[PDB]
Each structure stands twice: as structure tokens, then as C-alpha cells.
Amino acid sequence: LIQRYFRRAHPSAVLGVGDDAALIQPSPGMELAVSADMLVANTHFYPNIDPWLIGWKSLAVNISDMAAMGAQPRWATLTIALPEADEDWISKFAAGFFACAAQFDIALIGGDTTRGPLTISVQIMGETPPGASLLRSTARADDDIWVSGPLGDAALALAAIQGRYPLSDTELAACGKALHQPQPRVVLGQALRGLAHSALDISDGLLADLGHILEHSQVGAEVWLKAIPKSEVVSAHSQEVAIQKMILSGGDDYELCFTASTQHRQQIADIGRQLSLDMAVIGRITDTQQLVIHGLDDAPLT
């Protein structure tokens, strides 16, 4: 009834978190990796889609931030501004969020909601041994640059849904899995402790996220578009420039881009096969701090 400057989130019966869940016990000897995130609904492409998928992917993209640091995720908190009272929406969101948490053994230790334009905040916490974390700032000259899986599917699915690129129903059924349920590379990240010099997940595309590695590490890169892992659909259309743009800078892949000494090539390829991933070395970190991209004819651009 009283109008305060702000509304605050309160415990949600649908999320069902006990107030004693706020206390956790970190494993002795471990450091904790912490990442907080905020997702705002896009009024120009509003998520009028299955709220189960919204919940599932909302956690997944935060689990991918833990993977990028080589951490074992253990706990999450959730706060949500809901634009109207809609019991069906929050129940379905919760189911998908909880499904993703179960798959990755994550406990929800806070779950609160309030009223307002749709906004979802997740904080995720995980464990790493001291000094064994992977950072974006620590890439080295003559590192191989690796990508953990195919790039461009999520962007291609999105382009097709938006009427921007023509896909068949069969092609869209293939790429759409990568859009709606990206699989965070949690076990890979833990396996890369001691082997990778730097890592970051690819959320805003290879150019942007490799770019963040280069800017924070004060180094450059040389990459080959032909070397980048590609799905069957993306590979088939990879002669088209619109598709090459998606491979290099499409959103929402949620693979890891990581760097490592050429000494560890064989061990890293072996890990990739052991986890059923399609990884490749795409290029090399250089001393000269430019990003040069060789297209399919091997001709460079900066």
C-alpha cells in the first residue's frame, strides 16, 4: 500500500528455498569462484516462449561462467522481477531452472521474487584449488587458441526464427538445440586446470570473447576461419558471408575459447575426445596485439 522508492524481492513459495539454505560449508583448502549476472528481457524480441527453456538456459549461461574459470559449481541464488502475477510462468521457469541445477549438482540457496519488467539475476558459486583457476587475463605468446565445439548454430537458429536467413525445418531442428539448451562445459573446464593458460566462454561470439582475452592479456591473435569447428548445417553453408559472420561473432555459443602451450596439444585433444567434444586449435596468440582473421581463401583482415 505504501509507495517506497524501490520494491524489494521476497522469498518465493514456488522456488521453495528454506531460510537455513543460506548457510554453506566450503570444502577446506578450496577457494571459491563467484559470478553474478543479470538478464533483461528484450522488448524488441520479447521472450514469448516456453518459460521452462527460459529457466533452464538462465542457469546454464551462468554455469558456463564457472566452466570458463575451471570451477566446480556448487551453489546458486536466484532473484526475478516478474512483470505480472502469472503462476504458470514462474512454475515453468522454476522447473527448467531446477532441471538444469539437478543436471549439474547445484543447490539453490536463495530464491526471491518481486514485481517489475522481466529481469533475472543469478549468482553462482563454485570451488577451485588455490592457484588452479583459469582467467581471461593470462594468455601467452605462442599459445594455441582452442575452441571446445562448433560455433554459429545458436546465431543461425536465431536468424532463421527472425526471418533473416532461410533454413529448412530439418536444419532449424538441428541448430535450435544449441540456441535453447547450450551445454556448459563444466567437466572440460576442470580438466583444463594445469593445461590452459587462459579461458573464457564464448557468449558474445569468438571475436568479442577472444577479443576480451586479448585486451586483458595485452596480446594479439592470428586465427583461421577454416579451422573453427562447425556443425553439419553451419559447415554446409560456410561459403556464405552471412554464415561466416555468425561463426566468428554470433551470440550464444557457450563453448570455451582457451589458450595453452603447444606442448599440451596432444593431452588436450585426448581430453576433448574423452568428453565427446569436437575441439580444434584455431590459431595462435601473438606478441603483436592485433586480431588478424584469415578467411576461407586464407586472405587476412584486421
Interface residues toward a copy of itself, by CB under 8 A: 2-9, 19-20, 22-26, 28, 31-42, 44-47, 49, 54, 61, 69, 75, 77-81, 109-110, 112, 114-117, 119-121, 123, 125, 128, 130, 133, 135-137, 155, 158, 162, 203, 216, 250-252
Our finding on whether 46 is near Na ion (CB under 5 A) is no
Amino acid identity of residue 108, one-letter, is L
The least distance separating a copy of itself from the CB of residue 270, rounded to whole angstroms, comes to 28
Residue carrying the nine cell digits 557468449: 203
Burial status of residue 89 (CB atoms within 10 A of its CB: 0-12, 13-18, 19 or more)? middle
Select from Na ion, a copy of itself, none the partner in contact with residue 109, using the beta carbon and a kind-dependent cut-off of 5 to 8 Å: a copy of itself
What cell numbers appear for 172 in the block?
532449424
User: Angle at which helices 241-249 and 153-161 pack, to 10 degrees?
Assistant: 120
Answer yes or no: is 203 a known binding residue. yes
Answer yes or no: is 237 a known binding residue. no
Answer yes or no: is 261 a known binding residue. no
CA-CA-CA-CA torsion for 183, 187, 189, 192, nearest 10 degrees?
A: -140
Alpha carbons 231 and 150: distance in angstroms, whole number: 6
Select from Na ion, a copy of itself, none the partner in contact with residue 281, using the beta carbon and a kind-dependent cut-off of 5 to 8 Å: none
Answer yes or no: is 252 a known binding residue. yes
Query: Could you tell me which stretch among 2-10, 91-99, 100-108, 109-117 binds Na ion (CB under 5 A)?
Result: 2-10
The least distance separating a copy of itself from the CB of residue 117, rounded to whole angstroms, comes to 4
Contact 108, 78 (CB under 8 A): yes
Q: What is the residue-wise DSSP string for 127-158?
A: EE-TT----SS---TTEEEEE-S--SHHHHHH
Of 2 and 301, the one with the shorter C-beta distance to a copy of itself is: 2
Residue carrying the nine cell digits 582475452: 213
Compute how many other C-beta atoms are within 10 angstroms of the C-beta atom of residue 162. Answer: 9
Of 139 and 271, the one with the shorter C-beta distance to a copy of itself is: 139
Of 127 and 278, the one with the shorter C-beta distance to a copy of itself is: 127
Q: What residues form the annotated binding site for substrate?
A: 44, 252
Instruction: Could you list the residues known to form a binding site for ATP, using ranges.
Output: 111-112, 136, 203
